[PDB]
């Protein structure tokens, strides 16, 4: 399942992944409130129509197993959804 497809699957918006940032379980847990079992790729796209950052958290390559979805407000606030 393409990473692009997941975002549109989950949100209905057609966004291109602009970056995929690797993070360790501890720094992710600081944000999410849940600790991933290993490293996490933070696939993120800006939605300019809403001025929000859309973040798909996935396991590292080559699996890219979906873990969580975060949408960040124009005001800095996070909407978190475990996948």
């Amino acid at each position: 399942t393409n990473l692009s497809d997941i975002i549109e699957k989950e949100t209905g918006k057609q966004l291109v992944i602009q970056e995929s940032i690797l993070m360790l379980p501890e720094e992710v847990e600081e944000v999410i409130g849940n600790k991933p079992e290993s490293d996490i790729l933070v696939h993120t796209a800006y939605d300019e129509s809403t001025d929000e950052n859309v973040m798909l958290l996935t396991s590292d390559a080559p699996e890219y197993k979906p873990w969580a979805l975060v949408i960040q407000d124009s005001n800095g606030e996070n909407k978190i959804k475990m996948l």
Partner: protein, 230 residues
């Protein structure tokens, strides 16, 4: 056999025949992989980070992970090629710059060439990626080479700033001489980290003062400071 590096970089790295064989091997590995899929960036661009100044004139080292995987990579860390949107982390880098430098105004592009020519090394630890596959080339041999560049930069430069953003970049602090050099750390500029709790292992990126602290160190060390404006 082309090692892709500029002569200045070859002269700087003093690569032994052994290390030359190592570099050629990864380069060769990637040529193999390209016959099988699209790989970013182009081979004549994968070493673009080295073509902007004399390596002995490097003043600031900024580590990325691997290149952008959607066609936007230009052979520098964080920068994107002309016409692509400024990515989230870079947008956040521009915010910290705007917050800390009265004379910086975020540009509408993601070309970091003006930094690079001043001796800011924008170095991804992994220099290639397969289209649409972040991390795909993580274990092909790039890490020995960029670890080696990091180590030689530390060894050979009298004084240099290293900006290590996030825990993964932080692992490279073991290669760097913290006595000679200023090692600057914080969370990654990724939008995610912004909502991390108050008591985090690392400080927020927005507020790290990294770009001002770099120029303070450079100034005290009697070196040219970076004009961060783009």
């Amino acid at each position: 056999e082309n090692l892709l590096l500029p002569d200045l970089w070859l002269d700087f790295l003093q690569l032994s025949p052994i290390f030359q064989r190592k570099l050629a091997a990864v380069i060769a590995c990637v040529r193999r992989l390209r016959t099988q899929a699209t790989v970013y960036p182009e081979e004549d661009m994968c070493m673009a980070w080295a073509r902007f100044c004399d390596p002995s004139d490097i003043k600031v080292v900024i580590l990325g992970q691997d290149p952008y995987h959607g066609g936007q990579a230009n052979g520098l860390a964080f920068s994107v090629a002309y016409g692509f949107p400024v990515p989230p982390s870079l947008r956040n880098i521009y915010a910290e710059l705007h917050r800390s430098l009265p004379e910086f105004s975020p540009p509408d592009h993601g070309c970091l060439d003006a930094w690079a020519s001043q001796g800011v090394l924008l170095l991804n630890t992994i220099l290639t990626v397969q289209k649409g596959k972040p991390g795909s080339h993580a274990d092909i041999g790039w890490a020995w080479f960029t670890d080696h560049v990091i180590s030689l930069l530390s060894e050979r430069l009298k004084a240099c700033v290293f900006m290590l953003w996030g825990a993964k970049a932080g692992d490279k602090a073991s290669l760097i001489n913290s006595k000679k050099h200023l090692v600057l750390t914080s969370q990654h500029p990724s939008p995610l980290a912004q909502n991390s709790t108050r008591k985090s292992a690392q400080q927020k990126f927005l507020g790290n003062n990294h770009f001002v602290l770099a120029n303070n160190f450079l100034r005290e060390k009697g070196l040219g400071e970076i004009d961060w404006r783009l």
